A paper describes a structure:
Five GEPs (1, 2, 3, 7 and 8) bind T117 with nearly identical behavior, including GEP 1 and GEP 7, which differ only by alternate J segment utilization, showing that the two incorporated mutations did not affect binding, so no further IGHJ1*01 GEPs were produced for study. Only six of the 35 predicted somatic mutations affect sequence positions making direct contacts to the core epitope: Y/K32L, S/Q93L, T/S31H, I/V51H, F/L54H and T/I56H. However, residues at two of these positions (93L, 51H) contacted the epitope solely through main-chain interactions, which were not affected by the mutated side-chains. Replacements at three other positions (31H, 54H, 56H) nearly perfectly recapitulated contacts, also conserving the interface. Only two somatic mutations were predicted to contribute to a stronger binding interaction. The Y/K32L mutation replaces a hydrogen bond involving the tyrosine hydroxyl with a salt bridge. However, minimal mutations of GEP sequences to include these enhanced direct contacts only marginally increases affinity.
Author numbering:
A (entry chain B): 1 to 27, 27A, 28 to 106
B (entry chain X): 9 to 160
C (entry chain H): 1 to 52, 52A, 53 to 82, 82A, 82B, 82C, 83 to 100, 100A, ...
Amino acid sequence: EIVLTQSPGTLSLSPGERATLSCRASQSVSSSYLAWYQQKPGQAPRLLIYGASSRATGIPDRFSGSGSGTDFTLTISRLEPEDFAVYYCQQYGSSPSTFGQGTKVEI
Amino acid sequence: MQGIHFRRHYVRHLPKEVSQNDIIKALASPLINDGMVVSDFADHVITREQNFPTGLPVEPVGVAIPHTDSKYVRQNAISVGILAEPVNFEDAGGEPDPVPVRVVFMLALGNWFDITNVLWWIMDVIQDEDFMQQLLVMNDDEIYQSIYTRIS
Amino acid sequence: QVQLVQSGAEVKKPGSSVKVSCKASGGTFSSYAISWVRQAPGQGLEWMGGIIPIFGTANYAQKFQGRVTITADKSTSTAYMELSSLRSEDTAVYYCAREGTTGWGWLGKPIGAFQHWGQGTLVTVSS
């Protein structure tokens, strides 16, 4: 199975700053099969990115995804206090779909 | 439908004497030869069709989308088959009325998560009433060129 | 706009089996992939399997293959996940998740990534 290792593990930022999250894959995943999620405590995951670059419906332009092959990166441009939560990366290019361990964005 | 392998040798007119098992085994041959699927791919498509049918009673032309588990596929592909006259397929919706199929879209999908994309593409293709009616008269190359444009 | 309403929480004894249901609404049911994702109390996400209801068979992750049964009822737009031989490890919140569509509302092709999620079904295993 394909393992997704995210980095950093935890990230404390003040509002208005740029957060850069990484998602390293054990193998090459084609850019069309990687997604990013946001999850606040006591809630279901929220889809941010789906085509490695492409944005889900209603998601602001503050969130941006990028990458290819093994390395992928989620970038939050301007951090609002609503953005501080856990962020996961997902591969669905082959069965079974695997998730990252999660990067907690803190204040 | 991104990176779906499709060639001129994946289009066939099957003769008037064929049954559905003959159609499946016919449409799998070009895929098996190129190494797109396992050798016993036809068997698993026949086995699944019995339990979980792929007949779509669409007007004017009935359509079949026979496939199997994605573990039996190596490299993604699709194989089109045109029938001389109607062959009966069981309805995929679960109705007792049969589907007189004339166009068969055999799917060999390696990723399970892009199955719905290929299905959506087929639904859009079989919605075009003009194009579907032309598939019944066009030859092997004319069908290839028409379908190849639709994929890109 | 799609709603996925799951069944209530379950208090199970070890060795038993649980059947969690996901009721779909607001969009087409049979033409889209419905996945089941798990999350242990303070842990990350874990894909168990999924089903495309127009087609028959479910897709399973090898770890769960053998005691997880995913089905879809076309006649009630309800997907199910049945996990057998419940261990203490299986104590987690179980989500049903449906892929999105590349476009506004009900329009466009499917995207694969899970845009819609259920409220979550908490299953606890303890004697």
